[PDB]
Design a protein around this ligand. Structure first.
Ligand SMILES: CCCCCC/C=C/CCCCCCCC(=O)O
Ligand SMILES: N[C@@H](CCC(=O)O)C(=O)O
Ligand SMILES: N[C@@H](CCC(=O)O)C(=O)O
Ligand SMILES: N[C@@H](CCC(=O)O)C(=O)O
Ligand SMILES: N[C@@H](CCC(=O)O)C(=O)O
Lengths: 185, 400, 404, 400, 404, 185
């Protein structure tokens, strides 16, 4: 229950990180009709859009996250959104925090002295979760700015990533409370 | 033998079961075929059923003063008689004489009005987009976990992961609170979640109000005037027919306006054949309406699937009479037949039988129906099911 | 010889002018039919005199007598040479009197008074949700309470049948309850009931918003078939008229039933004059509806007070033609005049000005909403006071039981 | 001396401070009076200002071919000149010649559009009638007292009269519950009060939605087409004027429709005098609109209280020129003056000064403004006041 | 001699026909102005030849050169006998070229692209209540908490500043709070705050219902004065045209400023052709607006894609008359033709068919509402995640403080 | 506090009864424009309508609570309302209960033996209250079935009647609880 928890945390932490890294790298985030190739069924991703059954088949082009718009500046809402969409800093931050948590959960094993070792691991995992939610929101909002769009498997990985990221966060909290209760009394 | 020109349009003329197997008159089974047989018996005159090459009710060329289809075949004299649903018009009466009308007619409006679309289970979720619902679920998980962490962040606070999940679910529904955050860090989480809940619930309520308002203020077309006024609806009539000529010559202001629009409508609203008109209506889902004689509207309603219905009533009195070349010898006998056969009631019975036997189909509250909110009831019963199942799991666990 | 014209006085076909008493000759009557008669007179080159039939009923023939009355009666006797009155073209009439090609054709319509949104009833507050939803909410409420009770007693973490009923009733009204399910099995029941309550309350609020925004008033008889089935509104036709005859000879079962019933109704639903029919409708407040030709319905609607309306598709199309004695010398010229005037479109223009251009109504059609009056929400107050009554009664029952 | 016919209509002609004290030309002070003086100086021709008996801009009698008012006085030759805002019409040009126009004109629409009505404090209570509010108060007292009685009916139940009042107030607001009825008799009271609260709150919300929807979907008149379409608005024009003649002869379909309606409008929309038109607009509160030349619309807007404004822009180009009998000797000099005085800029400056000096008055969000919900804030601050006052009363009582 | 007609190609006055390349003569151009020219030709009894000025700008005079170009330029040189192009009647033009009575008069209008309801912003959820209400709600919230605190500490029946702040925040969100005022003085504060919360929440819900029901889109420049003040949208006129000249010579301060600015703008807001102006508007998406005669605005709106609209009252009325060389022989017949055709109303009928009857738009005007997209409510999610962030940050601050 | 309560109860009970009886008898319930006398300013009451500044001045006619209507029967909602309006059985019931309470509060003085004496008095007073509310509702609803209408002083007496009727009901409850606590222990 206590020892298995720590194993599940670590096992899950890498699985969550794995899903996020697969998601970020994969180009199957959204299936939609795109003018790119000749109203074409396209598997668009977080980073690159790959067309299917259009002008080409399997062709992958880097997406333009800054087209010719009405609101463009250094400080504009329309711009600042697209900046964050293009950068995908939130999806990435999630993975960095998941990895850094994956370090901190490992560090908690060797350094039982520091109860605050696992505390951090959890805090990171929850934050990684929050980051993911922003990441999903910024993405959906940017995609919007009726053509049918269906979220592909890559997105749902990022969805599943969050669910895990939250869960390992819960476990991390439980472990901290256990280790603190061991130090207590 | 008199060659009879007749358009193939059900129920007046329908193709028999096997077009290859049936030949001559036996090829076609229709009310007009039955009526032609009755005329043939009464007048003692042999008839040959054919379909005109042109396949049009009639046309007027102003330059040439020439008719087309059934009217054209009688004008040229190539077809000896027309036993057909051809409206008796002033323009037609001058070129070819008409016998007393067998049946009354009117210009009517055919639209797919009775779509009778099922609301569908999980239509209660329609006012908020699927992504909002999915983000609400993420937000719900996010808040609970964050509330749990902040409550347990500093060692000794009654908020376990399960109690935090409950508090959050309680706050979003707004129905109850078992417990309330005491910590500043906690109260911030709750405070902001409470704000999120208020705006989403209010958003849902509002937008659901928008949907139910706009679907209570839409008026289905009730009049020809209504049809003309609406731009979005495209009323269409057969490219070549008595109705198309009537609208062109129509002296009525509302009718002249409606006719003018047809010329100035893109894509062109005129349809070559009846079936093409019917398909155009079904594909448009009422974005395009069809103008045709009330008799054919009646049959389309009787025939499955009753997709197209009648709007208001018939615009004007029309009649279909036997058409022959002006001062033909055949005209006199067919005019007398139109009275003898009507008084016999055989003609009337044939019309009654054809519509009733074919007929497959033979009441509005603005109040929300069980169907509109059905999904919520299904979820409730499903939840009670799952709850009982989980109760038995807890009961089995408690024993061991 | 000057042609005596038997014209019935029915606006807008014939209207007596403001100063018609001061005026003499044909000047006294000004109408579409008067304009039409003048046009016929010009094409025929025959002087015409406007006259009104004493009875004013265009056709009346007793089956026993087999003698026509009204416009038909003046032509049969030969006293009137010509009739510009809009006589319906019927088979029975066609055999007795020669008929010109119809100047106008119109269907048999239904005239009913406009529906009233007045007097919101008690339990009008329950209107936005259908009765089956309300009944299912009650079933759902019983279902949830019982399931919450069973799970609580079978798998304890208390929730008695009475406490579970209270929790559920508390949750549906969005009122907080101090008792809360603690068990996972319990919290699922509550959780899903809470979801049910939020959507229904929100649905009710929304739909009630729809109703109060947009006023649609239900027509009492939407169609003729509906009218015959319900029998809620008595249906009447001109006591002596083509409409009364057509219904009697009608081969349709629903029409034969309606004719039998109208003939077999006391007091008589049959009315002497058009005006008598209109007044009967207004006095009945929709307890009596009127069957008349769509043309007169149209102008009656256009004339103030804009209460009587045309409902449903016309029962059948009827033409109105210039009427002459059988084999009259006038007949041929008038038939050619009707054809000439129809090609000219003069008839259509005359109809347009009289029928719609008059604009007594102006075809008037999102008026500023009214604050809810105690009537609209009266039911909820009655339920409240009834509940407080029952509560006190149950309190006294408990008080009496506690003593013994 | 040339007798000049001029209508008394501000700002062109306004009556001087003391009508008794001022005589001849000094009696009238206006832009047209100033303009007449300038014409008199430039042409070196003595002028006598009078007001025409008829007091009409002009009329056409088809039977007699006779004009009335200023036009009539020039046609008869009784008045030697017309220095007035008389529009140059084709019909007028044939009877009496016109000099080059001093100022441009257009047919405009005057309505009391800027009413700018204050919502008022205690407008938040508008969606529910006063009787409902008063009955809610009675119901609130009723429920609390009944809850108190049922709780205390049988001797030993934490519901005192003050706690019952609190519970009831808590339930109606839906914000909180300190305590909950345990007794069957109690739970019935609460149960039914909870139902009452849900329906009233929901009613209030809904009806308030209705009010704010209907006042967001009402479009103020933006075009002449809009004016013609709306039956409820009655646009009116002067009984006798160039604009009234223009609309009668107007070849434009929308204008012919608008003109036809004026004849078929009850009560009659035509008004004899400008002031009568202005008063009719103010009494109608926009149920009646006024059609007049854009110049006079401009002055009514400038003049306090700026009740009437302009809709869209001017329908058509018009001009006011000096009117003289066709081929009068005076015509030639006044035509040359209309150019000399325009180039001088004195005429232009006089018009600018008259409008600007008179002028008293010189921005829409659908969002609810503080004013709309002001009363609730006043009640809040009042309550906090009363609360403090009651707190001090409790503090004083606690001491003694 | 055949009269050379200098007509600019601007629909609907002049439109090149589908097969105008195949066609020869005047057949290539079909328009209102072509129809009008034919009518003038019939009254004058003079054969006419349709021609287009090379420049296509009706007036161009350099102040230094003082030489006219376009239709004016063809009349000055005498190469074109007559101009059916709709030349504006301006004082400067009137002195150089003889002008017939205006066939049509139209005002100087503003053409802008239609406003877009797209891209709901973050904090769009706060739109139904004005910013001052939100700020006053915050003040009211602080007011209530502080007053509840003071009354609780001064007249005790606990409510600390932090607990009072929590109670108030709890009450505004309609979320139940375990702590409740017990004192009469306290319960008054809570009681009235509860009333405030119920009405505001209900107000917000209602008004948000209004917004989502009824879409009204704000015009970027509602009036010309508004446009000049904001400077948000650049305003442009025909580089060489009556509109550009009128603004320069305009004695109005706002107009002089607008003229100076347009003249002093880089890149040039002045456009070579009408079509160039229309395209510039569409590419700018309302960053650039167009000033042109209301007549062309009208037909541009009627032609697809129905995006460019007419905003505000016309800046001033301008007439368009048949233009001839100073003292031309053609001048008198054409002036009489304009007067004859105006009395006939032929001109008005021609304008009606071309301007509105074409119905390319059909003057299209409660479309089915759309489910709220995450964008519309995005702000509330950002606030939620921001709050959770801040909460965690404050939790760690409390954790660090607890250690030391 | 205890003894004064009983005096206030009795004093108030007759005042409440007095207001109700004045209200019922008075003809000043509603000021409105009525066709009765020649769109006339009229002081209509619960029982009789008296016209002012019309055809007459001071003329009082018995009101027709059953005019020529659309819904008329033995059992109809429209009818059953008008029946209750015309009868004014609820205003009257209030007064009967107020009086009967006025008896029971007097009976509580002489018979201190019966604690249930005052219990009844209170129960009656609350019921009298409830009755009043129905009485106000049925009246307002019936009046409705925009001409200006203003509730005259007679109505507000019936309003004030309820407020008292409730209050004496509260006092009656307090007295019962006191007398029961005296019997208790
Ligand atoms: C204790 C804090 C309460 C704050 C009160 C806020 C409201 C005050 C009354 C506003 C009246 C409406 C007009 C005000 C004009 C304005 O500020 O725009
Ligand atoms: N059925 C009509 C034609 C109707 C139509 O044009 O659609 C005829 O006989 O000519
Ligand atoms: N005009 C009809 C009477 C009116 C009617 O019944 O419609 C007739 O000749 O009988
Ligand atoms: N001012 C206009 C009259 C306007 C109107 O008819 O209202 C004229 O000079 O005749
Ligand atoms: N027709 C104008 C040019 C177009 C415009 O600027 O409106 C002219 O003659 O100058």
């Amino acid at each position: 229950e206590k020892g298995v928890q720590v194993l599940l945390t670590t096992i899950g932490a890498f699985a969550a990180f794995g899903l996020m890294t697969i998601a970020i790298s994969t180009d199957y985030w959204l299936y939609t009709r795109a003018l790119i190739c000749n109203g074409g069924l396209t598997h668009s991703g977080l980073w690159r859009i790959c067309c299917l059954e259009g002008l080409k088949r399997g062709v992958c082009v880097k997406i333009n996250h800054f087209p010719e718009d009405t609101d463009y500046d250094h400080d504009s809402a329309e711009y600042l959104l697209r900046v964050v969409r293009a950068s995908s800093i939130f999806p990435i931050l999630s993975a960095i925090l998941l990895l850094l948590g994956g370090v901190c959960v490992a560090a908690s094993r060797v350094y039982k002295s520091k109860r605050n070792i696992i505390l951090g691991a959890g805090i990171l995992f929850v934050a990684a979760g929050l980051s993911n939610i922003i990441g999903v929101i910024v993405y959906i909002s940017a995609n919007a700015g009726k053509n049918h769009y269906s979220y592909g498997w890559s997105f749902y990985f990022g969805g599943l990533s969050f669910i895990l990221a939250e869960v390992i966060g819960v476990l991390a909290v439980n472990i901290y409370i256990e280790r603190s209760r061991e130090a207590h009394c | 033998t008199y060659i009879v020109t007749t358009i193939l349009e059900d129920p007046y003329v329908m193709l028999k079961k096997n077009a290859n197997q049936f030949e001559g008159n036996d090829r076609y089974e229709g009310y007009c075929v039955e009526l032609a047989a009755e005329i043939a018996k009464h007048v003692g005159y042999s008839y040959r059923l054919e379909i005109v090459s042109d396949g049009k009710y009639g046309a007027r060329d102003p330059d040439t003063k020439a008719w087309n289809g059934m009217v054209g075949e009688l004008v040229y004299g190539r077809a000896d008689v027309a036993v057909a649903p051809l409206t008796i018009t002033l323009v037609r009466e001058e070129v070819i004489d008409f016998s007393k009308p067998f049946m009354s007619l009117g210009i009517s409006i055919m639209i797919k009005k009775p779509q009778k679309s099922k609301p569908g289970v999980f239509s209660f979720l329609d006012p908020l987009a699927y992504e909002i619902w999915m983000c609400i679920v993420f937000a719900y998980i996010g808040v609970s976990v964050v509330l749990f962490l902040v409550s347990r962040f500093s060692p000794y606070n009654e908020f376990g992961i399960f109690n935090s999940l409950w508090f959050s679910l309680g706050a979003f529904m707004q129905q109850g609170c078992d417990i309330s955050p005491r910590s500043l860090s906690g109260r911030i989480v709750g405070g902001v979640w409470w704000f999120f809940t208020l705006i989403i619930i209010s958003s849902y309520t509002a937008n659901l109000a928008a949907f139910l308002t706009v679907e209570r203020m839409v008026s289905p077309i009730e009049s020809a005037e209504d049809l003309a006024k609406q731009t979005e609806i495209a009323y269409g009539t057969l490219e070549a027919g008595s109705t198309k000529e009537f609208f062109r010559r129509s002296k009525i202001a509302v009718f002249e306006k409606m006719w003018t629009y047809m010329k100035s409508a893109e894509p062109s609203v005129f349809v070559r054949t009846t079936e093409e008109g019917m398909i155009r209506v079904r594909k448009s889902k009422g974005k395009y309406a069809y103008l045709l004689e009330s008799t054919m509207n009646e049959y389309i309603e009787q025939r499955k699937p009753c997709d197209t219905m009648k709007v208001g009533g018939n615009l004007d009195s029309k009649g279909y009479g036997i058409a022959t070349p002006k001062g033909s010898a055949l005209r006199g006998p067919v005019n007398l037949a139109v009275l003898k056969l009507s008084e016999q009631g055989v003609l009337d019975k044939l019309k009654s039988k054809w519509w009733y036997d074919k007929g497959e189909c033979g009441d509005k509250t603005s109040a929300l129906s069980l169907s509109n909110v059905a999904g919520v009831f299904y979820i409730l019963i499903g939840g009670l099911g799952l709850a009982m199942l989980v109760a038995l799991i807890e009961f089995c666990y408690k024993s061991r | 010889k000057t042609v005596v014209v038997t014209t019935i006085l029915e606006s807008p076909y014939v209207m007596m002018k403001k100063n018609h008493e001061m005026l003499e000759g044909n000047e006294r009557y000004e109408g579409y039919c008067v304009d039409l008669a003048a046009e016929i007179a010009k094409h025929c080159g025959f002087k015409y005199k406007l006259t009104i039939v004493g009875d004013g009923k265009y056709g009346a023939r007793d089956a026993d007598t087999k003698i026509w009355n009204g416009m038909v009666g003046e032509l049969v006797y030969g006293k009137a040479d010509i009739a510009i009155a809009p006589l319906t073209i019927t088979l029975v009439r066609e055999e007795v009197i020669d008929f010109s090609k119809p100047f106008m054709s119109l269907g048999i319509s239904i005239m009913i008074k406009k529906p009233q949104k007045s007097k919101p009833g008690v339990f009008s507050f329950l209107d936005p949700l259908a009765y089956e939803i309300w009944m299912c909410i009650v079933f759902a409420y019983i279902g949830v309470s019982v399931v919450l009770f069973l799970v609580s007693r079978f798998s304890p973490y208390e929730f008695g049948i009475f406490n579970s009923l209270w929790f559920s009733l508390g949750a549906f009204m969005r009122q907080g309850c101090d008792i809360s399910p603690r068990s996972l099995s319990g919290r699922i029941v509550g959780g899903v009931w809470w979801f049910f309550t939020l959507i229904i309350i929100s649905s009710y609020t929304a739909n009630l918003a729809a109703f109060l925004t947009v006023e649609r008033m239900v027509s009492p008889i939407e169609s003729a078939e509906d009218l015959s089935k319900q029998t809620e509104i008595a249906y009447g036709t001109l006591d002596s008229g083509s409409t009364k005859e057509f219904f009697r000879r009608s081969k349709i079962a629903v029409f034969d039933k309606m004719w039998t019933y109208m003939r077999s109704a006391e007091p008589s639903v049959f009315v002497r004059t058009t005006a008598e029919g209109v007044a009967r409708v207004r006095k009945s407040k929709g307890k009596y509806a009127y069957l008349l030709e769509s043309t007169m319905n149209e102008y009656i609607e256009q004339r103030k007070p804009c209460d009587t309306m045309k409902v449903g598709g016309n029962l059948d199309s009827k033409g109105y033609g210039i009427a002459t004695p059988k084999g009259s010398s006038l007949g041929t010229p008038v038939n050619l005049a009707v054809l000439k005037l129809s090609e000219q479109g003069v008839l259509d223009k005359l109809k347009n000005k009289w029928w719609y251009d008059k604009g007594e109504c102006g075809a008037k059609d999102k008026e500023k909403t009214s604050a809810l009056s105690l009537s609209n929400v009266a039911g909820v107050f009655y339920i409240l006071v009834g509940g407080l009554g029952l509560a006190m009664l149950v309190a006294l029952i408990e008080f009496c039981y506690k003593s013994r």
